[PDB]
Amino acid sequence: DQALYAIDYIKNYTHGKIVKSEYWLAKMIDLFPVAKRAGVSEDVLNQARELHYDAHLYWEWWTAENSVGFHNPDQARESLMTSISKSKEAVSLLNDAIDAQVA
Amino acid sequence: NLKPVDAMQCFDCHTQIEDMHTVGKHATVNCVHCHDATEHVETASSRRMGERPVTRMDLEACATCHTAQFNSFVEVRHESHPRLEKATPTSRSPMFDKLIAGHGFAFEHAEPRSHAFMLVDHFVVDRAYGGRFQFKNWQKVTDGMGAVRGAWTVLTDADPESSDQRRFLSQTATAANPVCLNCKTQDHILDWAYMGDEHEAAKWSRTSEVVEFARDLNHPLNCFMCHDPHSAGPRVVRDGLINAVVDRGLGTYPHDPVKSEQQGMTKVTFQRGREDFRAIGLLDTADSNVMCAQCHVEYNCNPGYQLSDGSRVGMDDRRANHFFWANVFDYKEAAQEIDFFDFRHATTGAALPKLQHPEAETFWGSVHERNGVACADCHMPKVQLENGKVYTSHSQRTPRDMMGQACLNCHAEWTEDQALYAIDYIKNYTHGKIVKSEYWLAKMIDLFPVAKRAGVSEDVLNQARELHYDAHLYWEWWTAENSVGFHNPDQARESLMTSISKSKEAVSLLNDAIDAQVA
Amino acid sequence: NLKPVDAMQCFDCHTQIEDMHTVGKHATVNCVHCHDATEHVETASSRRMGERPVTRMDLEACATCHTAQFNSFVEVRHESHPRLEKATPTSRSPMFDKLIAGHGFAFEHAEPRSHAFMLVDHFVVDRAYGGRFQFKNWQKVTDGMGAVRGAWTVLTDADPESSDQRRFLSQTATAANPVCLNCKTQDHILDWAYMGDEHEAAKWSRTSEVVEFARDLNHPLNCFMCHDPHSAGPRVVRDGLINAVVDRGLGTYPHDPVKSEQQGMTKVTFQRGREDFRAIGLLDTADSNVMCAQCHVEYNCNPGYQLSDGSRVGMDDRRANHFFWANVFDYKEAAQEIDFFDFRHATTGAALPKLQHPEAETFWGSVHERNGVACADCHMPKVQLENGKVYTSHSQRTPRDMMGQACLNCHAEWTEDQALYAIDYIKNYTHGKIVKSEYWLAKMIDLFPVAKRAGVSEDVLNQARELHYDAHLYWEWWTAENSVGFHNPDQARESLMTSISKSKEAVSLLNDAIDAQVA
Amino acid sequence: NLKPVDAMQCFDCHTQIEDMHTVGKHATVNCVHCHDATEHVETASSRRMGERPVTRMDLEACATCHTAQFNSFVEVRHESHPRLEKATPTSRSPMFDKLIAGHG
């Protein structure tokens, strides 16, 4: 029971960071149509697309991998925190650009 | 081997301890079990401490003569899933990230696990210390006995050379402050003045550097939090609780003056240099409702802002250590009474409250509470033995693990499966209304950017923000509270229906205003 | 609530207690936990007792600070079948009635059950008090906690107005005497002189009226039988054991002088006025082999007869309280040394020994004993806890209930089923040889009436009687011993083959003599 | 205790019930098990009901002679989770509120 509990600690923690990475990716993705329709420049959209590559990579590795973090818990944690960081940077970029177009 | 000291010599100075120790069930328990005071005795005067004696606060100090209670307390319930994030589709609050955006809990909020881990879990959670403290390795997460022995036996500090709060991992927060620690440990009981006020005799206070404070603390939920070590009689030590019940005269049962008198609290104060320093609350009866309410309540333990003018309320302010001592329908008035809110929502801009596990305030007025039932009856009942000396279980956990003692002794008309079915009926119904409240809150929140970008007036947005306060309060109480409605099902239902009503009113307001701007 | 007494004042007289109490792990344990000495202190001098202080012998005196050990001790093992007669085809000795005829054990001899019941079971067995004492009703047979609280809380006396041993039911015997009680209780520890010799300061002795003595005794297997109450250190209190080990110089391990020196015993005597009165044996180490040997040995605790001339040896004689402290192959010589036998066989007329549960003397020289294993390793091991303070189980019972701790910790090469299979191989083999030994003993016994009636000479019958002594000894050791050979399988095998050899020799002798007379 | 009624008297009016009752496996089951019709019999005509008889519709009316089927029917399956809302992430329709908006 102690060994199973140790596995579940890692899987539960990793899965929560996968879900949070998805929340931030989804939040960024939903801003793209709003930005395009508001007249945000291709230069800004391309900057956001470059951030999307990294936000996607550092998340999808972990939904693709079958151990839910168990095989390398510190690596999963560092990667998923990077995904979230990249999405947040993209959300800020797009929101600011949308707000400038509207004003 | 321990050698007894002359307690009468101590009592020549310590008349308060004499009055307590000589009369209760620890009258034969010598001071040497918990104190090393040789140099203190040689140097103290009637008014000055001299050399400070050593006081043991480890739980093993009580385990020598009370092994059964200690072993029960340190049991790890492996079925209480560990490090399980609440903001996921399969846990308590699927839309928590959207609803709580702007608050430190967004960084991590896991479900509770067994009491042995409370202090280590406080130190390692991602929202507390910027990831500074971690288990030594991932095997240590199982070690309840090690955590009890001391947090620093199982944890590391990423930088022992600095004491500032900062981020060591990118997606962390630094929400921890000294007030939090009062619901994780009382190792600091002699080093902390009542309420965490500045005091000459206090090493630590509300305004301390929390990283330095953390390093001085070791043990979870000390045995003496509910039991006076000198009299062995029932008590509480938590300052904010004593402040609500006694200082503010609210009583142990604010809705019931008679029960408050029968089951009351007496405040006892201890001085340093003849100035009030610390306090305890002795209980009239061994009332677990009040013992557990030292921590299982809604509280302030953090900086915030004034509702009146939006200005900062810092750790230096008494409001940073506060027990509201109010049920869900009295809470808004209680927060207005101290002119306080917690955070501004990141999307809506609304001033919002942050709610903490309010089991004690939720239990008031429930069918079980009105019938004289208390937390311990369901969560730490007497052990049943075919042959043996009965003692009280100290493994505070769900009644599902001990249904015979926790439920069926009172409910003779039910089998175990029938009692579980009754619990699940209430939890299933309540959870569906929590999910529906989140759906309507999320729908309202998503309209704020659309309204702002459409040119909706600040007057209309401010009206919606006022509705957001209520929609949030009447929802979050129930994701914060751990029983998923069981502790007071009719109250949960009325509150969650109010949340939904408030969100719907705000959605209608915003949609109409957006539509007018567009036309 | 208890109020502590001034222990230093006691020590002004009691220097022997001071030297024990101040040094051990009970230095902080006040006398008031076990003594009521107020009127004693008011009236005593260092040379005059004054009023006799009260001493507590109840187990709850220890349970107050050691609940885990107490609760483990009082557990009832329901799978240890109760009141199960050994003289039946499905138990230990199918032909016991034929083989033991002439002895009191023929009236009833049940298998042992849990320790909580030892004093009540002694009082109610059909062989002991003529049926005088019974459980209050048949429900009380389950009440281990009640028996521990006191025998007289669960038993009745058929005639409180008389104190003579007599039959109240027809098929009972009156074998009980005061020496028996020393292996059931030590409630009388302050009222019984060493060995039960007559003494001015002793209320009770070997020659007391056993019904009166019985009425004054309450508790089974007191906690202080293995633990000194003043030092908390390991000891024995049983007079017969101290007499064998120390007075007679045999040592704790008669077959190993080195182990006897490393794991020895120090006799401590306590005086009444100028005179030696009682004694204990303090142990060098916490050696359960010697603690359990206070009772699990072969003994005299009864009147008998002399081998030399057939004369009666009564309770007044020192031989009526005796530990032989000899293995099966040394026993005959040990009994010759004191010139003693137990009974004359009802059919054969042979002088015979009666054997009592010789677990300690059987265990000597076995593979486990030679490897430093002790009774507690298999029968009261440390508890294993995922999280908790380790303590020693006090539920003395078969290892089958705790195979992980009792066997598999040392035998990593085995599963539980493999270890059980190895135990059963030995018990099955040993039991088959016990049954064969009984077959040959019964065949011999049955020839005695045929031989007598055919006019076989007394010289021949006497030769056969001398063979009966050995055939008996080398069989009954193993029905008396409770492991069915497991404690020493090679010795059981050698002894049982000797029994069968002796019976076959007697059968041949008698058949030949019968045939010559005829055819 | 129940006392049987004269079913043939009923059948004088109730030919449809006669055709059904006399032929099936309840031909020996008396009307009193399910109907109290004393005042009805005294007041009815061939075409008018008169006083309305009582008709039992409780399941225990069948349980007297068919206890096994009744006991099987009333069993509660505790594993069939009660009051469990379908519009939640862990049930049948996670997005039900959005999709059904406008319906009760």
Ligand code: HEC
């Ligand atoms: C008079 C000379 C004293 C003697 C004798 C003992 N103590 Fe004391 N103690 C004394 C003072 C003036 C104070 C400061 C608080 C006050 O009452 O004014 C103390 C403090 C303590 C404490 C608290 C220590 C802390 O960290 O805050 C303890 C635990 C304590 N003292 C214990 C103690 C013991 C066990 C004594 C007998 C061995 C003893 N004290 C004697 C004054 C005097």
Ligand code: HEC
């Ligand atoms: C463990 C079973 C203890 C026993 C035995 C004794 N003390 Fe104690 N003491 C103990 C604790 C955990 C604390 C911290 C405060 C709390 O309320 O839990 C204390 C504190 C004191 C103090 C300080 C009181 C104050 O001014 O703040 C004093 C003066 C003190 N203790 C004295 C004392 C004496 C004299 C004892 C022998 C009679 C004694 N204590 C026993 C734990 C335990």
Ligand code: HEC
């Ligand atoms: C042995 C030296 C002890 C130490 C160390 C601790 N306690 Fe104790 N406790 C002890 C005794 C002999 C008793 C009386 C037993 C009886 O029932 O007569 C107690 C009692 C308690 C109680 C019950 C009090 C009551 O019901 O009024 C409590 C709650 C208790 N003890 C708690 C406790 C704590 C928290 C300890 C560590 C600070 C502690 N005890 C140490 C003996 C000993």
Ligand code: HEC
């Ligand atoms: C021997 C071949 C092993 C196997 C099979 C398993 N584990 Fe292991 N584990 C092993 C070692 C030598 C270590 C390092 C410990 C040390 O010596 O310092 C570990 C470590 C772990 C950890 C901690 C991982 C971390 O990142 O800190 C965990 C949580 C753990 N082991 C669990 C675990 C599980 C659940 C296993 C079965 C699936 C398992 N281990 C097998 C050695 C071996």
Ligand code: HEC
């Ligand atoms: C008493 C009024 C408390 C204050 C002050 C703090 N916490 Fe707390 N905490 C308390 C309880 C009763 C519980 C269990 C019930 C629950 O809903 O969780 C907790 C739990 C935690 C946990 C574990 C669960 C989690 O949220 O991840 C952590 C990590 C935690 N608490 C941290 C924490 C912080 C950082 C605090 C100061 C900002 C704080 N707690 C104060 C009771 C009380």
Ligand code: HEC
């Ligand atoms: C409050 C959250 C508690 C903590 C911390 C500790 N105990 Fe406790 N204890 C608590 C309750 C509600 C009760 C039952 C009181 C009643 O009469 O209903 C107890 C009881 C005890 C006792 C008395 C004997 C018994 O009933 O078991 C003892 C000796 C005891 N508790 C010891 C003890 C120890 C050693 C603790 C730390 C491991 C401890 N308690 C903490 C509530 C609380």
Ligand code: HEC
């Ligand atoms: C019986 C009438 C109860 C009383 C009195 C108290 N609680 Fe309770 N609690 C009860 C139930 C049926 C549940 C749900 C348990 C389940 O397995 O579904 C709870 C839940 C909690 C929890 C969370 C426990 C968990 O799920 O692991 C906590 C922290 C809790 N309760 C605390 C608590 C407090 C502090 C109480 C006194 C104010 C209290 N409970 C009383 C049943 C009962």
Ligand code: HEC
């Ligand atoms: C000298 C004035 C004494 C003081 C002070 C105490 N005790 Fe004593 N005790 C004393 C004597 C002379 C005797 C009799 C010795 C003899 O020769 O027989 C005793 C005896 C006891 C006993 C044994 C009683 C029995 O059943 O045989 C006990 C248990 C005892 N004393 C306890 C005791 C306690 C606890 C004391 C301090 C409270 C104490 N005694 C003081 C002489 C004196």
Ligand code: HEC
């Ligand atoms: C509380 C007032 C106690 C009473 C009553 C009894 N015992 Fe005790 N015991 C007590 C303490 C505080 C300790 C020391 C704990 C430690 O490890 O520091 C002990 C110790 C023992 C031991 C172990 C001794 C050793 O290893 O050297 C034993 C065997 C023991 N105690 C037995 C015992 C008996 C038989 C009692 C009834 C006569 C008894 N104890 C009462 C506290 C208290």
Ligand code: HEC
């Ligand atoms: C209610 C209809 C009962 C049934 C069913 C069982 N028992 Fe009973 N038992 C009952 C009573 C009222 C009594 C007498 C209690 C009293 O007033 O003294 C008993 C007694 C016993 C006894 C003791 C018999 C004796 O001769 O002393 C035993 C051993 C016993 N009961 C056991 C028992 C068993 C095993 C049952 C199921 C087969 C059983 N009882 C059923 C009341 C009732």
Ligand code: HEC
């Ligand atoms: C210590 C050397 C003992 C003496 C003196 C007496 N008995 Fe005993 N007895 C002893 C042990 C170790 C056991 C358990 C092991 C076993 O083989 O039984 C017993 C058991 C009993 C029992 C229960 C089993 C039974 O035989 O029915 C009884 C009723 C019993 N003992 C009675 C008894 C009598 C009457 C004694 C004096 C003639 C006597 N015992 C002395 C250890 C010792």
Ligand code: HEC
């Ligand atoms: C001999 C037949 C014993 C009887 C009677 C009692 N105990 Fe015991 N105890 C015994 C052994 C062999 C041991 C282990 C010694 C070792 O070091 O291996 C113990 C130990 C204890 C202790 C120490 C703590 C622990 O290891 O659990 C205590 C406090 C203790 N025992 C208490 C105790 C009580 C309360 C008893 C009466 C209910 C009791 N012991 C009887 C052997 C024997």
Ligand code: HEC
């Ligand atoms: C002719 C005088 C009748 C007699 C004899 C009985 N019934 Fe009747 N019944 C009669 C009529 C005209 C009606 C109205 C329906 C129709 O066929 O036109 C009824 C109705 C009933 C009903 C239905 C009652 C209802 O609530 O709708 C029942 C259950 C019924 N009748 C039962 C019944 C019984 C059991 C009789 C013998 C005891 C009986 N009826 C005789 C006319 C006549």
Ligand code: HEC
């Ligand atoms: C006793 C007075 C009965 C009452 C009341 C009810 N039923 Fe009955 N039923 C009864 C008998 C004697 C039989 C025949 C048994 C056989 O197999 O011979 C039946 C049969 C049925 C059946 C089976 C019919 C078939 O297979 O054709 C059914 C479905 C049935 N009964 C249902 C039923 C209902 C629903 C009742 C309450 C309205 C009811 N029965 C009452 C005897 C009795």
Ligand SMILES: [Ca+2]
């Ligand atoms: Ca939990």
Ligand SMILES: [Ca+2]
């Ligand atoms: Ca709050």
